[PDB]
């Protein structure tokens, strides 16, 4: 119910995990066939980290 | 699942095996040798 405090503050942040890209990254001219991200673990050929 | 133009993964099957002798799988519902010709063997593993 509360605003975090200047202790309690912290960033989002998408780390690399198992894929073969970085998330920073996809904007650099990467091409694929297809691409489509999920919340689910079926199906996925690799993963990113939230943190 | 496969369709005309995909396919697309939608579950998981998993596996618990311990390797060995016992247990054969087989084409249907054994002990044919060919002998003196070329043949295709599978002669205890």
Known sequence: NSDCTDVLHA?????????????????????????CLSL???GANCKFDVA | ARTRTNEQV???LYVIYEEG???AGVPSDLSVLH?????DY????
């Open chain 2, 21 to 23: 002798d016992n247990i």
């Open chain 1, 11 to 35: 960033t989002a942040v998408i780390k690399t995990g198992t894929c073969p890209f970085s998330f920073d990254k996809l904007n650099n001219y990467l091409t694929f066939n297809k691409f």
């Open chain 2, 10 to 12: 939608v579950r998981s």
């Open chain 1, 40 to 42: 689910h673990p079926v």
């Open chain 2, 42 to 45: 599978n002669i205890y593993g």
């Open chain 2, 35 to 39: 002998l003196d010709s070329c043949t």
